[PDB]
RNA sequence: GACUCGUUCAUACUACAGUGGAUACACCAGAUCCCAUCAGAACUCUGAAGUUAAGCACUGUAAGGCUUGGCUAGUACUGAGGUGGGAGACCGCUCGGGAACACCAGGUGAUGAGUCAG
RNA sequence: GGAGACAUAGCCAGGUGGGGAGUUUGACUGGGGCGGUACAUCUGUUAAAUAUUAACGCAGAUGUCCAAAGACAAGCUCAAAGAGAACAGAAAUCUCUUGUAGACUAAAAGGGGAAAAGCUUGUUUGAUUUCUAUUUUCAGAACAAGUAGAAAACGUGAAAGCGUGGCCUAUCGAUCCUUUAUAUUUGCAAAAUGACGUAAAUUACUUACUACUGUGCAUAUAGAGGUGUCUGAAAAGUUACCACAGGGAUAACUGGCUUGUGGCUGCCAAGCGCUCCUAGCGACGUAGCUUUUUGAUCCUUCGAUGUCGGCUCUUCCUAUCAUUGGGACGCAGAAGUCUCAAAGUGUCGGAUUGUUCACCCGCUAAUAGGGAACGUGAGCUGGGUUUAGACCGUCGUGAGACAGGUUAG
RNA sequence: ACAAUGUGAUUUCUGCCCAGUGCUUUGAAUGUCAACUUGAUGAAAUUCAAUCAAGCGCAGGUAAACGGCGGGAGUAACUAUG
RNA sequence: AUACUGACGUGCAAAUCGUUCAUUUCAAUCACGUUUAGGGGCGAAAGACUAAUCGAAAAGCCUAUUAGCUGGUUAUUUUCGAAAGAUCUCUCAGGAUCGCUGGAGUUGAUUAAUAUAAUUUUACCAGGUAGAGAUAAUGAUUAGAGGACAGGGCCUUGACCUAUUCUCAAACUCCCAAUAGGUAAAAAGGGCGAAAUAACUCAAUUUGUAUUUCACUCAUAUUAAAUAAAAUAACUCCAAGUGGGCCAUUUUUGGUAAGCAGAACUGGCGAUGAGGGAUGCUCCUAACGCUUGGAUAAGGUGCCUAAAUAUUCGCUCAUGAGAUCCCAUAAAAGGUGUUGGUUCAUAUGAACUAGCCCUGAAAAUGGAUGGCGCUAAAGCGGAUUACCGAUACCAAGCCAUAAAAAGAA
RNA sequence: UCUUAACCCACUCGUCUUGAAACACGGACCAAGGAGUCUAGCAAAUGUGCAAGUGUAUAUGAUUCUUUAAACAUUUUACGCAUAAUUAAUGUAAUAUGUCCAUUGUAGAUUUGUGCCCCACUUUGCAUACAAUACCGGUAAGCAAAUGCUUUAUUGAGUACGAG
RNA sequence: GAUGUUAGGAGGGCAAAUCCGCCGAAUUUAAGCAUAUAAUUAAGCGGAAGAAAAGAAAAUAACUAUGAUUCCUUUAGUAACG
RNA sequence: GGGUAAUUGGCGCAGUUGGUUAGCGCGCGGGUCUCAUAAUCCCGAGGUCGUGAGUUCGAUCCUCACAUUACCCA
């Protein structure tokens, strides 16, 4: 039975009520789909730097211990 | 639509290389009587109470998707290839 | 009724008068680094990588680059909320933005000005002026040059 | 003077003229081989006998076009206000923003990298 | 007596089976049914210069076609127009000049395209396998259609490159089930099925060691068979013999808005009116009024506003028919036409029809027009329309249908 | 006679059509068409074939069975009609 | 049991009464006994009848059957407080799921701050609607002028060109606003350096990339532009109700129009009183604890009716004046009514013009500027004051709620 | 307090409804009765006990036997849920022995210090948010004779000192 | 095989909560309904007892094996059916 | 979908592993009073694709169209 089929009316009024929400703007994010090649290279880089840093920290600690 | 009967293509199984395949048209064939679904259906049907299921009867489209069967000559392992529904299909016909 | 991919795009995606014909060769050379700002301007001399209507005239950060593709983080208003959308486009439509460059230029100019001021120990209001009211002044007008007026009769 | 790569992509175009060819471009000479055809026209190859006639460069024209600027015009239009006007159609005022074609005047290029020749 | 291993009966099995049973018999819908699909979609437009966005709005399209119309490279430039060349004419082919697209691009319509995306030619099959990040609609689910990549293997080009279907925007399908593919992946519930295989060993219930081990059924993974009421019930009619839950979310009745339609009044003045615009008229045109018509509408009433007409009875109106008083005239009188004040007073007998209406006949002074919930059913009447019975036709296989008639109610 | 219908005294008449749907009659020449049976294959389950049921189909019969029962043009001393 | 559609119709009766009428030796009537029972009986057939019960009797049970539908659905105060959109739905009176709401909690702010904002700014974009155009393209489309191909006799009709011309388009576009929209404005960062790390990159173990580690150092005593009862914020959970809506300005599509149908933006109304608009769901004012005084808004100030029979300059007589947004009708056309203008001519004749006024102006119960009334207006148009006038505003009290100070003799 | 007055104001409540004082419906009156419950299973919230466990089930035992049909008690692997996941499945199953240490970041509460209290440095680095790596089950892909292997992909309601 | 008022005895009916045989629905659920569902329920009809029925392995397991029947606690909202 | 049968010259039909027909018709010439008639031309993707063999329209296989019956978890 003939009944009004659309209107955007009042929707805007509801929408502003809790404000137009923003994204949460995270600094880092997942790199999952992003470029194979470059990110696998990076994984190696991080492992390399981390390994050097760990070895130096251990060396300082064991040396300090005596 | 008309497709030639042999085609040099990548072979998925027991190969890595592009090689020749023979091309044929898939067809459904007779359902096996002892297949599980048919057994259950036969049991439901049996005895009183008349027809027991839906029957897919409304019937709309007048075509059915065409599917090519690919067989590699080098290694006897077959593979399916699906493409758009067409009304008139031909294999190996006139150029 | 229908709302397909290029729906309602008639004048929007069409080129301006005398601007038909292939994307200029020079335009592929432009530099894109991660986190650079980038406009999404449609073309139609290229067909692959054409984006949907909404991302026309929008601008966002570049987050990912491929062989000829560029991922752009664009804000989209969806009812009560903005959410971030990853529009993959090809290079022909992606254009290096200028809005960032105003700020960047300002930083460079400010740094030099600040370094000199601080060296002299001369305290300074580096922040933007943001046009104030008009200050008082004294103005010579020749008494023979002034013209006097009245509203015109009707015709 | 000239060239090779380009850039802006008509102030760079087009149409009709004139003016210019050290070196350079070019037209132009030829067909054995590579090559290409219906056709050495093109293309390819091999030349260097001729020539500014053209291409090309440069300039001209109450040129067309294109391009700046004025002027069209505070006109057209318009955001906000109004227990404003008007029977209605529509039209003012207050706070604001503000065009276009035509027309008229100017303009007809600029330039990055490399190279050769007095 | 007769019939007799046939009957019959018992159980299976096919047919027949509205005789009887159970059940269903979309939705949208400017009432419903009929028509249509606006139900899945795609273009342009409506849409109000981001995005958004409606009506059974408008102009349309979709359920395909394609081994090339796909893929890549190369070469070439088209439509058309002019001027030419036996047959040769507007068309035939050939040539030159002009030719930014006026062509062609599978198909709607809009975009895009000239050393091409077009046309011609060469070589080909990437219209491939596997996997992401995602866009569109959107719940930021699904399918579908894409965009950007990655791991493979290739195709083309000298090479950069480009190629993961069609220049871009449309061309479509869940679960169960079936079906056929894939695998050095698995199962069939206490066990076994290649094979006593390969070595040994002794005479046996011997020891080591082996990715590959019956039929059938099942899984896992991947397609395909279809649901167009297109996010997916297997579904025909009828009731004026009917019931019940509700609905003024919704028709048939008034009133209400509007007044297309009807009715009534204007304004213009080309003409008509013997000559003469206006005595009387008045086209071509144009402005209003009215709600006595018919519509459009669906605001009010469906836990009932008694649904036509006649009879009777009263009052109101005036857009005057008569009567009274006037004015104008194409007015001699007479007869009369138009017109102004006028609603005081009046406005009939019948034939025929259920009739509003209509048509006659006759009287007449004239037989004006209307209103009051279409005035008037606890005033009547009940002829009509609108219950159950019935008839005839057409229509329907039927039950039954009929803004067709007719009769008892 | 029993059963089942239609019509409805008398009188006078009871035309056309078996295509459609019914109803109905023949059959081992005959297409299909079930269980069983019977053979073949297989280690077996299975899987295959084959046989004279009726029925329908094939060939007829039937309207006091249901029912049904056309359209355009042109043509006569006037015109008209046909 | 026919007719009176007679009596009665809260009856004499849940079918009676009066009068009229059909029936009487047969298909006749009655009594009693007897037979047949509920999807059954029986029927000279009306779906009739089967004990006031029949298109499926009566009784009890399955059974408190079932109902997306109707009605109802119980003390107070206090706090916060909706929706009538959206997607899918054999879906349009429903449901699901989003949206919008409350409670609970944590995190964070609690440092006039950074986060942040229905805002502007300065930068920077993106646009193709109003508009504008036709001699810019496409489609329309009216005219002539000047020229060098077709029919007839230099000439005629042309076609055809060339420069022009009149008017145009939601589905035309050279060009093109306003409004609306996006991105920008620095410390988890940015600078300029060094050094490291990688299987990536590149010719390049240093060619880059990116990360990482060290350095040096960028505004901050107003805060890398303003402004901000800007953290009353984030975020999580659990759940509600709702998913029929409607009206005004402005934009707007269909329709002759409509208190009509359909949209866009915003505000309302709904759920909202109070003061004003006489009267009223939506108009104006203004949003409401309880009070006292003050001063106003919107609106008024002849009386009804609280304020002025105020002041000041005009206009207006109507034998159907006129009088307040929405809002409760009036036009084309006339006027030797009066009032101003404006243009012409020789203190007049002409021609126009717009104020009020008049004509045009007809409807039904009696009758409505809100009523009485009003003409030196209480009318119409101004201007000037003064005043009266709300649950709004200011001051003060009192209440609760919310937060804040702040407290273990 | 009640009672009339008087000025001014003041429409039938309930109700479904876009809109009710309605020519919408229900209500003659009065009194009493008269409508979101109970169980099952699940969830979150919050309270409470215990805590890698937890619940003492059914049942037994007691000088427990009006109340008591409750309370009390339970000789050093019963069962539920938890404690580990994942795959259709035979099944397989969490860094890894260089170390009783407890994967890496960036923010980030709490702490230490310096130059009894605001600062600004430093210092430790929770919760949590965002990532990143490892590794486990399934699946790919590469290899393959094996206690199957792999630097690579993926997928899971997975894991990285418990929380029920 | 009959027959007997032969001699001695027995069964019939009432009562149903629990209990045992049959026979057997539908409302209902699925937002419709046809298979399923309601439910081996209700109604119908037969038969017992102070309890009845069941019971002394044609059982389960696949273990270091258990060991008539019934019931409780449980496995378990699981294997499974649809 | 099963199973069966039918499609061969203008028309209508036979035939199947050592074959492309017969009749009607058409065309044309010959012929008895006019025709019946004889003779010769006409004139064959044997529905389609592929295979099996000395040899196939024929047989095996493939497929469409027409026909008749029956199935319809499709």
From Swiss-Prot, chain B:
Keywords, alphabetical: Cytoplasm, Ribonucleoprotein, Ribosomal protein
Coiled-coil regions, chain positions: none
GO biological process: translation
Cellular localization per UniProt: Cytoplasm
Gene3D superfamilies reported for this sequence: 3.10.450.80
One Pfam match: Ribosomal_L44
Superkingdom of origin organism: Eukaryota
Main location: cytoplasm
Molecular function terms from GO: structural constituent of ribosome
One cellular component term from this protein's GO annotations in UniProt: cytosolic large ribosomal subunit
Physiological role: Component of the ribosome, a large ribonucleoprotein complex responsible for the synthesis of proteins in the cell. The small ribosomal subunit (SSU) binds messenger RNAs (mRNAs) and translates the encoded message by selecting cognate aminoacyl-transfer RNA (tRNA) molecules. The large subunit (LSU) contains the ribosomal catalytic site termed the peptidyl transferase center (PTC), which catalyzes the formation of peptide bonds, thereby polymerizing the amino acids delivered by tRNAs into a polypeptide chain.
Family: Belongs to the eukaryotic ribosomal protein eL42 family.
Description of how the protein assembles with itself and partners: Component of the large ribosomal subunit. Mature ribosomes consist of a small (40S) and a large (60S) subunit. The 40S subunit contains about 32 different proteins and 1 molecule of RNA (18S). The 60S subunit contains about 42 different proteins and 3 molecules of RNA (28S, 5.8S and 5S).
Protein's name in the database: Large ribosomal subunit protein eL42
Protein's organism: Plasmodium falciparum (isolate 3D7)
Gene label: RPL44
């Amino acid at each position: 039975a003939k009944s009004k089929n659309h209107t955007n009316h009042n929707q805007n009024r509801k929408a502003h009520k809790n404000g137009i929400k923003k994204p949460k703007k995270h600094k880092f994010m997942s790199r999952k789909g992003l470029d194979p090649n470059f990110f696998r290279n990076q994984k190696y880089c991080l492992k390399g730097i981390q390994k050097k840093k760990k070895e130096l920290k251990l060396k300082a600690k064991q040396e300090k211990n005596n | 639509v008309n497709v030639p009967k042999t085609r040099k293509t990548y072979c998925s199984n027991k190969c890595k290389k592009h090689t020749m395949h023979k091309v044929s048209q898939y067809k459904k064939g007779k359902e096996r009587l002892s297949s599980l679904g048919r057994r259950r259906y036969d049991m439901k049907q049996k005895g009183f109470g008349g027809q027991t299921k839906p029957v897919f009867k409304k019937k709309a489209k007048t075509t059915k998707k065409i599917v090519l069967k690919l067989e590699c000559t080098k290694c006897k392992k077959k593979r399916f290839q699906t493409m758009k529904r067409c009304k008139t299909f031909e294999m190996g016909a006139d150029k | 009724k229908s709302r397909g991919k290029r729906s309602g795009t008639r004048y929007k995606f069409s080129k301006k008068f005398r601007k038909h014909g292939e994307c200029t060769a020079n335009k592929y050379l432009e530099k894109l680094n991660y986190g650079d700002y980038v406009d999404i301007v449609c073309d139609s001399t290229q067909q692959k990588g054409m984006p949907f209507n909404y991302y026309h005239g929008k601008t966002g950060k570049i987050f990912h680059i491929t062989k000829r593709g560029v991922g752009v983080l664009v804000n989209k208003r969806v009812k009560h909320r903005i959410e971030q959308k990853k529009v993959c486009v090809r290079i022909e439509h992606v254009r290096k933005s200028r809005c960032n460059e105003d700020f960047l230029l300002r930083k460079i100019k400010n740094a030099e000005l600040i370094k000199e001021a601080k060296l002299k120990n001369e305290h300074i209001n580096i922040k933007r002026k943001t046009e104030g009211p008009k200050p008082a002044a004294m103005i010579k007008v020749p008494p023979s040059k002034i013209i006097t007026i009245e509203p015109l009769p009707f015709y």
